[PDB]
Amino acid sequence: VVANYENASMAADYIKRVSNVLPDIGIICGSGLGKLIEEIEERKVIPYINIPNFPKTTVAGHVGNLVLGSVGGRKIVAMQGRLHMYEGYSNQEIALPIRVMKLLGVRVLLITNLAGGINRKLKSGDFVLIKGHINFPGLGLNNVLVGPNQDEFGPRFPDLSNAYDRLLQQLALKIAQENDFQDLVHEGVYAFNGGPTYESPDESNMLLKLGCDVVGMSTVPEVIIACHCGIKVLAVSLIANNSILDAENDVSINHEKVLAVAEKRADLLQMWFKEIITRLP
Amino acid sequence: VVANYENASMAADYIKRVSNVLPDIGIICGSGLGKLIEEIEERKVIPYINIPNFPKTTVAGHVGNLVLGSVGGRKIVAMQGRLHMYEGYSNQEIALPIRVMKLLGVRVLLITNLAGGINRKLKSGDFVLIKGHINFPGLGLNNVLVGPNQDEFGPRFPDLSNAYDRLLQQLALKIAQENDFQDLVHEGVYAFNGGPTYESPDESNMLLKLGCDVVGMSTVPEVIIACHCGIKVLAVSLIANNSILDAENDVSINHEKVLAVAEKRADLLQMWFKEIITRLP
Amino acid sequence: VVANYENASMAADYIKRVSNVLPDIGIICGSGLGKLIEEIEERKVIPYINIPNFPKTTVAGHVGNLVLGSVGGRKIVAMQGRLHMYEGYSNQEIALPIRVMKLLGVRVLLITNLAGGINRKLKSGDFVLIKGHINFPGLGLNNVLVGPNQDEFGPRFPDLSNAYDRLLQQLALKIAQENDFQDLVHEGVYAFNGGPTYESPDESNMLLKLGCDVVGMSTVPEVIIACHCGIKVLAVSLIANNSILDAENDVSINHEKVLAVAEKRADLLQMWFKEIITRLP
Ligand SMILES: Oc1nc2ccccc2s1
Ligand SMILES: Oc1nc2ccccc2s1
Ligand SMILES: Oc1nc2ccccc2s1
């Protein structure tokens, strides 16, 4: 199924008829960082399998729901179960839910992810406000926009220089300062590793040379589809490790260690994003 | 349809029966740089849709013609409507028209494109003679030659060190000097960005570190197919901007600005390539 | 055909019924480096075309056999005819033979390849023990593990930091010292060029900047599938040239020159790997 105007419209019509919520904020939460979704008020849960033209996610399994409701007095839609390109989903499958958000009325998209640290100032448990990216799949002919352009949504050749809204980064930092955890908050450039293997020790050393501050396997495809259709983005990485130190010391990362860092910072991140939603202009 | 000997032969036979031109020069023109094709003499226009085994281009739309005729006393074939890999065309679709050129008798292929400037000496409106390239799709398993080798055309493992003919670069510079616009003419290394998004500000900074002088979304696939089958190449970039300055100043590029630079330099480039064709050995 | 547990099990059952060998060592030999396979003792040759679920290799042609038998008193299985991703084989086709090795009992995989030299200390005829890699296809969304995870074989997110066993590198060096050819033996980082074009002169210069010591078109896909399912790896490159010198001098490489270096070093490499097999713990 192509992520075109007709197919996205049929999905949006179903959601409007089931939900009665017109959201203007969308959220996509990283591994182990979804507790906020469980606290949406006056909420409606819509399994992906029931939405016309949504991608099939049964081979992967696990949760796959759209959740609509209220947070801090604002109307929102959340993806509960994020789609990743290392699972084998196509460009069209990644893009369709973001384009449905657009048709539903979403103007701001808030994103979190788990990432490895490259910059020497970063350690386990830190947060990085993403200010730009290096898209290795895009340079190498696997950009999420390869294919015919869907002109109803945006232009053939997008400019990404303002993909990460500056005012939203400033608001996120302001709230950290107001609650005295600003010493955890950095800014940086995100390298997109297609995955699913963690970057090797020698790949980590290369990324340091290239000006990358963090590395992850998500986020950039959704950012590009959002920017193409005029949705503002805030993206925040939770740092699980420092991959440069691990390479120097012959120490390794694994998914169990990553999830343990997520559980340590989950409550703080939930509170932070609730206040961001509340305070959005 | 595979870009094999039998399929290319059926296309070449049709063209010979309609055209009565046996060209030894081929040309592929960049965005907004095709006025020379409109001035081919004693010309025959053959829409792609009518040529056996040519790729289907109706989803994209717009012009798609082969044009054969005479320029400066030489017999030529031009692609009017260039195929780009960011549109979703396969390796086989990109390669078949170049292999048809080979079977028709083409020995030299002349190419122009629009590109972003990386080297600090480059500004809007400059020309770059391409002397080498960095093929990010090729390193990343999206080379135009991935698949079975078509042995009738060339070897399994090509050497690209002479892909950009040195004598043709010298002739192009000589003509610029003869007509006193050599101050516009540089040489440089071309980075292939698969596209369709313009390189991000942080990608631009990375490309500077890696020794790239310009960045574009075309040209390298056709160069590789030509080199594989023994066709000499001259490739010239028209610089639309300097992406490093734009990143430092938080300024952006877009397709409207690119086309405006093309219109400013179109007449000069048309005259330059007419004389190159005339003077080819 | 997917490289899943059921499909690999049907292949392994056929091999066990034809062969009566339960190997614990697997070998994959590089271009022109397969003489050791011709000397396996008490051997059984099984053409790929006869093995359930093995990939079809007739479009490429040439030899394609599994060979089981004894070397130095050890039970081994060899791939005679290696699959390369530049030929167009999918992730699943590359992975299935390695996963069959796992089910047959293989615990150690020995690999050779032909490669270009990047490090200035490397010259034609040298050997490089591979200690790490830079996987350009993997960073760019063409990792061999893209797709659903086959949980029976390994984890969704593998760690590659110990992919190249340290003790096996030390044993290989010890044997070189015992037979006085240690002056040929280096260690280094392997860059995976998807291919099939040799790295261009400007790509070679980029690879030097990024910390690469050698460049090749094979090996990394098999290493990743082996590491995912717990098989130890030793990988050795035979250096055909120095690509940085060739770029500075405007000199070229080709497949004929590569095979001539392989023939010069074939006998020594055969003896080295026979002793490694004999001495494995
Ligand atoms: O490509 C990625 N490297 C890392 C390291 C830590 C955590 C998450 C990710 S995702
Ligand atoms: O990848 C590309 N960057 C640029 C900038 C300007 C113009 C054209 C192109 S194509
Ligand atoms: O990507 C590759 N470059 C080279 C050079 C020499 C030999 C073999 C290979 S494979």
Extents of the domains making up chain C: 1-281
- Listed resolution, Å: 1.5
Counting other chains too, the contacts that C171-178 makes at CB distance below 8 Å and 24 or more residues apart are C171/C276, C171/C279, C171/C280, C172/C129, C172/C234, C172/C236, C172/C272, C172/C276, C173/C129, C175/C272, C175/C275, C175/C276, C175/C279, C176/C127, C176/C272
* Rounded Cα–Cα distance for residues B78 and B19 (Å): 13
| A241 assigned binding-site residue | yes
Distance from CA of B217 to the nearest CA of C (A): 16
Chain C residue whose CA is closest to B194: C140
| A199 assigned binding-site residue | yes
Beta partners for B242? B117
| Cβ–Cβ gap B202/A134 under 8 Å | yes
Secondary structure class of C126 (helix, strand, coil): coil
Dist. CA A192 → ligand 1 center (Å): 10
Dist. CA A115 → ligand 1 center (Å): 4
Best CA proximity match to C108, nearest among C27, C13, C22, C186: C27
The residue type at B256: E
Beta partners for B233? B109
Secondary structure class of C184 (helix, strand, coil): helix
What's the half-sphere exposure (Cβ side, CA atoms, 13 Å) at A66? 27
Best CA proximity match to A15, nearest among A53, A42, A41: A53
Query: What's the 3-state SS for B30-49?
Result: CCCCCCCHHHCEEEEEEEHH
Atom of ligand 2 nearest to the CA of B258: 7
Token pair 């352009």 in the structure block, residue: A149
* Residue from B113, B118, B190, B215 to probe ligand 2 pocket by mutation (most atoms less than 8 Å from CB): B215
Q: Distances from the Cα of C136 to the Cαs of A117, B76, B219, C269, in angstroms?
A: 20, 39, 21, 28
Query: What's the 3-state SS for chain A?
Result: CCCCHHHHHHHHHHHHHHHCCCCCEEEECCCCCCCCHHHCEEEEEEEHHHCCCCCCCCCCCCCCEEEEEEECCEEEEEEECCCCHHHCCCHHHHHHHHHHHHHHCCCEEEEEEEEEECCCCCCCCCEEEEEEEEEHHHHCCCCCCCCCCCCCCCCCCCCCCCCCCHHHHHHHHHHHHHCCCHHHEEEEEEEECCCCCCCCHHHHHHHHHCCCCEEECCCHHHHHHHHHCCCEEEEEEEEEEEHHHHHHHCCCCCHHHHHHHHHHHHHHHHHHHHHHHHHCC
Annotated binding site of B: 198-199, 217, 241, 255
Beta partners for C255? none
Question: How many B×C Cβ pairs under 8 Å?
Answer: 102
Q: Which chain B residues have a beta carbon less than 8 Å from that of A203?
A: none
Secondary structure class of C148 (helix, strand, coil): coil
Dist. CA C88 → ligand 3 center (Å): 18
Dist. CA B271 → ligand 2 center (Å): 24
Interface test with A, best of C161, C166, C193 (most A CBs within 10 A): C161
| Cβ–Cβ gap C88/B147 under 8 Å | yes
Beta partners for B214? B117, B190
The residue type at C155: P
Best CA proximity match to A259, nearest among A33, A10, A21, A4: A33
Secondary structure class of B79 (helix, strand, coil): strand
Q: Which chain A residues have a beta carbon less than 8 Å from that of C146?
A: 85-88, 194-196
For domain C1-281, give the fold.
Rossmann fold (3.40.50)
CA angle C256, C262, C267 (to 5 degrees): 150
Could you tell me which residues come within 8 angstroms of residue C57 by beta carbon, excluding any fewer than 6 positions away?
C48, C49, C64, C81, C83
- Using alpha carbons only, how large is chain A's radius of gyration in Å? 18
* Rounded Cα–Cα distance for residues C114 and C112 (Å): 7
> Sign of the C-alpha dihedral, residues B207, C247, B239, B71?
negative
Task: Determine the length of chain B.
Answer: 281
Question: How many A×C Cβ pairs under 8 Å?
Answer: 102
Distance from CA of A222 to the nearest CA of B (A): 14
Q: Retrieve residue C111's tokens.
A: 């690999």
Q: At what angle do helices C220-228 and C91-104 cross, to 10 degrees?
A: 50
Best CA proximity match to B190, nearest among B237, B143, B120, B223: B237
Selecting from C140, C157, C189 the residue whose C-beta is nearest the C-beta of A140 gives C140
Chain A contact residues (CB < 8 Å to B): 132-136, 138-143, 145-149, 155-163, 189, 209-211, 224
B129 — phi, psi (to 5°)?
A: -75, 120
Are B246 and B198 in contact by the 8 Å Cβ rule? The answer is no
* Rounded Cα–Cα distance for residues A109 and A223 (Å): 9
* Residue from C124, C198, C213, C264 to probe ligand 3 pocket by mutation (most atoms less than 8 Å from CB): C198
Could you tell me which residues come within 8 angstroms of residue C182 by beta carbon, excluding any fewer than 6 positions away?
C173, C176
Distance from CA of B16 to the nearest CA of C (A): 31
* Rounded Cα–Cα distance for residues A157 and A152 (Å): 14
Please give the span between the terminal C-alpha atoms of chain B, in angstroms, as a whole number: 36
Q: What is the largest CA-CA distance in chain B?
A: 56
| Cβ–Cβ gap C86/B143 under 8 Å | yes
Beta partners for A235? A111
What's the half-sphere exposure (Cβ side, CA atoms, 13 Å) at C85? 27
What's the half-sphere exposure (Cβ side, CA atoms, 13 Å) at A19? 26
Please give the span between the terminal C-alpha atoms of chain A, in angstroms, as a whole number: 36
Best CA proximity match to C94, nearest among C195, C221, C235: C221
* Rounded Cα–Cα distance for residues A68 and A27 (Å): 10
Dist. CA C131 → ligand 3 center (Å): 18
